[PDB]
Design a protein around this nucleic acid. Structure first.
Lengths: 101, 101, 122, 122, 101, 102, 101, 101, 102
DNA sequence: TAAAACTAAAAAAATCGGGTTAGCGTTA
DNA sequence: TAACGCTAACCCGATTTTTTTAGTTTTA
């Protein structure tokens, strides 16, 4: 009850869980080839947030002179940029809540 | 009564109270798998504001030469950025007041 | 009647007056659990403006070499940013005037009648 | 549910009831500055008294404080513009000029949010 | 016939000509107390443009080493910012052409 | 007669009069309010000022060698675009843009 | 048949070809005096792009130490800014395709 | 079954898989010559994301003094810029989900 | 004759002609005004210029070691996105975007 | 060389044209 | 004590202004 991702698109291995969730959220007939390309980019981004968040939690534990507040500031911003991009991607595929019921 | 969060998404442990509140705000049938991924990001952010606010109140108590006005300025900005992101996330899930009232 | 704020959300103690005012501005049945979380953030910000304004008035009194014009400039900007964020928060909860009274054009007459009353008096 | 027709007798009662109570008093916790009261009274009188919610009144304090604060900054600016020679701080002059425009634009947004802009009142 | 400006608002003396022109541009009954406050800010800005333009013409006459191109650049920008603000203010009072034509 | 005269206090520059006359003729004379006429002075002054800046820019572009100031050239180019975009907004505000006049 | 450009507006001599094209693209009766002023600015800009592009092609030929990558970058940006301004100007005069098709 | 890309447009060789997917997502009669040019730019961008992502994963493996956090920051931003441009391109060709579903 | 010829003064580059012909054919010939043809030259020149910048970029990306200029690489990448976005605006302005033609 | 400050375009908020309720006098 | 004749308040979908934001330039 799913589709398999395009080979050329380059879905990361740990992103598959995310891919399956996105595809199941809209009628299977309604996925075009163009949409499936776009869905790879969405899944990759949803994965990448988990990776950056891990990086950030590490840096926040360090305390004293070693603590890099500049890096902390950057990781915080990169996480918000991804989150907002993901909202745009969802809207583009019409799998945002307004379009689904 | 509620749904359980996706394992791969990475909901932080102290964010569960927030997760439960968000899911209860809209009919259970109307949550898709894509929406549940998005709801993890919302809950994590609602938690993270409480964490930053604690950090800020600490720095504001310090007075004299030790007081870092640059860090105070940054924490204040990061808190507004999160707040505005949360409004966007709510709208995307249709759990903002207009959609529920 | 009112609602009590969520424990986990972390409403600051001196923010309670603000919380009560916001909740009373819309029908109690119409508050969801998601909205109540959002209402804590609104109340905290309405409090925090009063705190920054106090900080600013202090710095503006200082004169001479000690006067920090850079800090004065920053506090002034932070106050406008908060104010604009509060307008967005209000809109999100539908407790801004448009949502609690309707389209602008549908307020025209209501107001006229009041202006009229106010003359008959004088 | 629907609001009373502005035709109704009922409507004309509320209007007369309204103008008897001339104004509302500002929330204590909000922190209206003392010299801002004149501005507060003008804003409240510009729309029907029944139509002010508790949420709106909090927001109206922020509007009044800003309308006052413009007069304060403008005084500061006129002082600096008189100074000439080496003492003249063109950097501060530039900043005061910008802060005044930012406030002005914020005030327009605040008015619209409370529905006391001309479109809603005329 | 006209209205008199609020005392506390602080209409500058040389701004009165501008004040009178703005008030005459819409029916006298239709000015509320809130509008009159707002109209002071409009009149002060229409005055202030004339003041800055005088300052600019002075600096543009100076030539050689004394010429301050940085100040010239700033005065030019300040004049455009005022002009754009005045268009917003006009719209807010409904004395822009669309509302009066 | 054909036109209106500009408000004295507004400060229409002398060489801007040709522009003023063109703008006023572009909409019915009865339809000009006192508020509009103030706004129309700012429009005319800006339409003049573009011609002045353009002259300044063409001078600097002729200079070549070490004397050539590329920083000033860059600034004059930007100032001219900002004015042009402001003029579009001003026209819209007076309803003398093409959409309103057919 | 065409109209002749206003003298005071300052249409550049080599811009006339552009002027003629723009005027012919909409009914002659429908040009007001205000529009003709605006049309001069459009024609001057359409000319000036050709001039900057020539400047850019010169700089791109130079190679070695003499090559100014900073100027190349600036000329590239100035050309895009003009192009986008021209789109706005066209729309304002209602000689864009939507209005004429 | 498909169309062949314009020679002058310059579709990169490894982009062909992407090209085929995009063309198949809309009725063949409905592709104009202008659209086909635009579709080359879309395909090239969908390819180029895979290339940048590879570059980024390399830099993220390096640790110690050699690690360039500045380059890591830049690659992360360039990937989001491409992704947002791709959404605009899709909308322009009407092969986004709203137009096809 | 199923196309139009470009205005001489507009300055269509020689290698841009293939692009010009494709754009003109994408909309009914009667519907091209003289103003549109000027605008269409700018569109064609930009569609060409992307191919030129992309070639420049691929050269710089091959260089590795100390010679590699990451600053130039960053700039070329940005210039390519700016052009792309401008082209979308130009298409819409001429009504040869898919919505108008489908 | 990073931090502050500008600036288009997209996402959002307000407005608007035209239709439908439904209250409420007022005429009988 | 009704029935009828208006209007005000609300509603749906379209379009117009405005804010927010992603992204660039500037300045110390």
């Amino acid at each position: 009850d799913t589709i398999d991702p395009p080979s050329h698109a380059g879905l990361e291995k740990k992103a598959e869980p995310f891919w399956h969730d996105n595809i199941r959220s809209k009628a299977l007939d309604s996925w075009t080839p163009a949409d499936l390309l776009a869905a790879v980019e969405l899944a990759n981004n949803q994965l990448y947030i988990t990776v950056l968040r891990k990086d950030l939690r590490k840096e926040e534990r360090i305390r004293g002179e070693e603590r890099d507040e500049g890096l902390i500031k950057d990781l915080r911003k990169q996480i918000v940029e991804l989150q907002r991009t993901i909202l745009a991607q969802r809207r583009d595929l019409q799998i945002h809540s307004h379009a689904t019921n």
